[PDB]
Amino acid sequence: SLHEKMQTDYLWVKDHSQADSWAKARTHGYNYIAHTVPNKKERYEMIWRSMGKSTDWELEKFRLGKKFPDRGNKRRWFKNLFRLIKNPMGYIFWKTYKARLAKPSLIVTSMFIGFTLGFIKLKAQSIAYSKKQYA
């Protein structure tokens, strides 16, 4: 009885007044899924639970209703591109912060730079040899 008593209670299930004005996630998480994380199966359970609350665990309403994408991820590639152009050093710095916490040795860092700059130096010579072939 107490279970149904609270389900029917309007106060127990009532959106706040500003709830309409708030930003609302219009997806249950089935649009972009994490496939290789160790909590993969735990993620699916929360998607399944969210889909059930929307339909009172009568998923026939979901099968009949409209399915929508995650319109919040729209134009996300363009937006990150403009942020990289605005401040590339800041975009690169923060996107690589957690990776740079583990810093390799001076030797490895030097090998990276040396082989990278050496590859660029040979690329420049091949560009010059092409101007020699054009002449």
Ligand X SMILES: CCCCCCCCCCCCCCCCCC(=O)OC[C@H](COP(=O)([O-])OCC(O)COP(=O)([O-])OC[C@@H](COC(=O)CCCCCCCCCCCCCCCCC)OC(=O)CCCCCCCCCCCCCCCCC)OC(=O)CCCCCCCCCCCCCCCCC
Query: Contact residues for another protein (CB under 8 A)?
Result: 1-3, 5-6, 9, 11-12, 14, 16-18, 20-29, 32, 34, 38-39, 41-43, 45-47, 49-50, 71-77, 80, 83, 87, 89-91, 93-95, 97-98
Work out whether 96 is an interface residue with ligand X (CB under 6 A): yes
DSSP symbol at 10? T
Residue 115 binds: one of ligand X, another protein, none (C-beta under 5 to 8 A by kind): ligand X
Question: What are the tokens at 98?
Answer: 């957690």
DSSP symbol at 102? S
Q: CB-wise, 26 or 61, nearer to ligand X? A: 26
Q: CB-wise, 13 or 127, nearer to ligand X? A: 127
Q: Name the one range near ligand X by CB under 6 A: 15-23, 38-46, 54-62, 99-107.
A: 99-107
User: Is the CB of residue 59 less than 8 Å from the CB of residue 52?
Assistant: yes
